[PDB]
Amino acid sequence: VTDEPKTDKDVKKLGQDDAGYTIGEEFKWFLKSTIPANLGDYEKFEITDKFADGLTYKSVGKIKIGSKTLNRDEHYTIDEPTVDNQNTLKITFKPEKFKEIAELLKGMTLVKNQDALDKATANTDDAAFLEIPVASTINEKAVLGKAIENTFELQYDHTPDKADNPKPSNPPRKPEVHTGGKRFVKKDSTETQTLGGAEFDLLASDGTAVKWTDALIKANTNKNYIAGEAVTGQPIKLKSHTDGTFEIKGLAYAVDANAEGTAVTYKLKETKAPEGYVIPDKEIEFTVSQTSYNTKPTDITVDSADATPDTIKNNKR
Ligand SMILES: [Ca+2]
Ligand SMILES: [Ca+2]
Numbered sequence: 001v002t003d004e005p006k007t008d009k010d011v012k013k014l015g016q017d018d019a020g021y022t023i024g025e026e027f028k029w030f031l032k033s034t035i036p037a038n039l040g041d042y043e044k045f046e047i048t049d050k051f052a053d054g055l056t057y058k059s060v061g062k063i064k065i066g067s068k069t070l071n072r073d074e075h076y077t078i079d080e081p082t083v084d085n086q087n088t089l090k091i092t093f094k095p096e097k098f099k100e101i102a103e104l105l106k107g108m109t110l111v112k113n114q115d116a117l118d119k120a121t122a123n124t125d126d127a128a129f130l131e132i133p134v135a136s137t138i139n140e141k142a143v144l145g146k147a148i149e150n151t152f153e154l155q156y157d158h159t160p161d162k163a164d165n166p167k168p169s170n171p172p173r174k175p176e177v178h179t180g181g182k183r184f185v186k187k188d189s190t191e192t193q194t195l196g197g198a199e200f201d202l203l204a205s206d207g208t209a210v211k212w213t214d215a216l217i218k219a220n221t222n223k224n225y226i227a228g229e230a231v232t233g234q235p236i237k238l239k240s241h242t243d244g245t246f247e248i249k250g251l252a253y254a255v256d257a258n259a260e261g262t263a264v265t266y267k268l269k270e271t272k273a274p275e276g277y278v279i280p281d282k283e284i285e286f287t288v289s290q291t292s293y294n295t296k297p298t299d300i301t302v303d304s305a306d307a308t309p310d311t312i313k314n315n316k317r
Pocket of ligand 1: 008009010011016017118173174175
């Protein structure tokens with residue numbers, strides 16, 4: 001047993017490991033490390049997080065030990081993810097500052113056990129650890145219904161021996177996020193033909209409109225499925241293509257559960273019927289689940305778009 005760093009990563013909030021999001025919706029990952037009282041001796045404390053293709057890094061938030069804040073460019077530096085570094089974040093805690101950071105720990109009770117770290121739901125002076133919030137979104141590269149994991153590696157040098165000899169610490173268990181989709185086909189009442197030109201407002205279960213963002217637009221590039229022009233801040237409106245089909249990609253499901261977790265209901269309000277058909281007076285419910293877009297997301301590295309679409313029927317004038 002040592003006092004050397006144990007690491008863990010959470011998502012959404014401290015103590016949570018699984019969450020579901022709509023593409024473009026910003027949320028926080030939490031990079032977590034125990035801190036030893038002899039931190040002042042350390043010659044390296046560098047965190048590297050290679051974000052999955054399907055994640056877009058936004059920013060690093062307020063870095064905390066217990067109630068105390070660490071300041072950017074005073075206590076640490078950031079190297080942001082880019083195309084050139086393969087989407088990799090590096091956070092370097094300044095060796096010249098290790099004594100000053102160690103002094104901040106005075107009076108604190110430090111978390112020391114891996115399981116205690118994993119279970120931490122707060123970061124306080126009486127149960128303190130290093131907490132790094134990282135703002136992130138799920139992007140268009142996600143596989144719908146698939147767990148998108150994250151982790152990081154700490155390279156730490158605990159020996160004040162004037163020799164560069166770091167060791168790794170890694171989270172034993174990885175948190176994950178997921179997003180989903182749905183496929184549809186518009187038909188007549190007896191399901192004999194497909195119908196183009198039906199238009200639908202996309203709504204949450206509570207009837208509130210789902211709005212476009214730049215990120216959602218990037219995930220739904222097939223203009224055949226979009227009613228009118230899609231621009232950020234405006235309600236999402238979808239359209240059946242001339243083969244009856246349309247889709248929505250990147251809606252949250254299993255909000256507080258794993259990638260196999262509970263489906264979420266959304267609604268379509270039909271606002272335009274295909275030529276010669278009537279507008280219904282009831283909204284259409286559908287669910288987004290692990291398998292509502294891809295039948296086997298755990299097996300694939302790109303969408304297959306093979307789940308059975310929901311049929312939506314129209315009645316003739
Ligand atoms: Ca965790
Ligand atoms: Ca050393």
